[PDB]
């Protein structure tokens, strides 16, 4: 009722902005970047477990993925120290 | 069979990197950024069409959201001209 | 100020349920479904605009995408009819 | 440029559906359901930690909330046993 297309734009925006207005407001944003030949930690861990003999289990395939990052043979896409499976990586020099 | 834990680390990585290695790759990644009080264009459009009388179809609500961006009352999170429902937005100076 | 871990649980819940309690309460919910090989309308238009010659502008790619939905070559994941770039689709029968 | 507006529609779609076509695809989707008076598990835990006395930290608030689901005071909107902060709930019989 109380707001319509005749209300000034600035006031409608302040209404949408006020606490408890109804608007979904969260403390994050997801941006899509086009980086050819990237991959997830989980895809590296998979590939090593299934293609490289001698791992007693998957957690050792994950430690090996981790040493590849330390060695700079894969690289983080934004600056991070520690390996995670959920993060995206690209290849180092080679 | 031909790769195991005894193999050269760099050689194992160059095999993973080759064409047709089986390594799941693709050309896009998603980054999460912590922006306080950010919101989706689609939710702005949901809020308007739900709370502001005078819109005959949802498209007039999207066009109004477009006008809010032109006016600087909402703002893009990254350098972009035109409005989209899939992008993330913050409020301007109010 | 005067609710604590010693208060009646049902009374706490009631306090949180009252008007103006400050709990975020809203007429919506969002659900994650696992659907292998699902794609967004906007990615279909993008694919068609970049790979199929003869689209003078991007809106013509959109209308073609709508004509895929209408012919059943792609399918909405819920009960809708009209094409939207924001919804998720899957492939129809292609055998 | 082997495909145009002249090509068979079914053949264009089979192209798009082929391994390595370039079409961006995913194994998850998000759906909006209109449900009156629904709230996020993390919003309940926040509301408890801020307005109820005697929680030395946030994990004790999370546990109380999980207790609230067990007693039937809040309820899951999809059949799930256990409590989780990213799932949606409604009020029970009050």
Numbering used by the authors:
A (entry chain B), B (entry chain A), D (entry chain D): 415 to 508
C (entry chain C): 415 to 509
What does the paper say about this structure?
Purifying lipoyl-tagged DEP (Lip-DEP416–511) by size exclusion chromatography (SEC), we observed two main peaks, corresponding to monomers and dimers (discussed later), in addition to a higher mass species. Thus, we crystallized the monomeric and dimeric fractions and determined three structures at 1.84–2.06 Å resolution. Remarkably, each structure exhibits a swapped dimer, regardless of the crystal form: namely, molecule A (turquoise) donates H1 to the H2–H3 core of molecule B (light turquoise) by extending loop 1, and vice versa. This dimer-specific interface is based on six new hydrogen bonds, which may bias the equilibrium toward the domain-swapped configuration. Interestingly, the solvent-exposed “underside” of the connecting β sheet presents a hydrophobic patch, made up of a triad of hydrophobic amino acids (M443, L445, and I447) located at the DEP finger tip of the monomer. In each crystal, two DEP dimers associate with each other through this hydrophobic patch, thus linking four DEP cores into a cross-shaped tetramer.
In addition to DIX, Dishevelled has a PDZ domain (Post-synaptic density protein-95, Disc large tumor suppressor, Zonula occludens-1) and a DEP domain (Dishevelled, Egl-10, and Pleckstrin), separated by long flexible linkers peppered with phosphorylation sites, and also a binding motif for the AP2 clathrin adaptor (Yu et al., 2010). Here, we use structural analysis, as well as biophysical and cell-based assays, to show that the DEP domain of Dishevelled undergoes a conformational switch, from monomeric to swapped dimer, to trigger DIX-dependent polymerization and signaling to β-catenin. This occurs in two steps: binding of monomeric DEP to Frizzled followed by DEP domain swapping triggered by its high local concentration upon Wnt-induced recruitment into clathrin-coated pits.
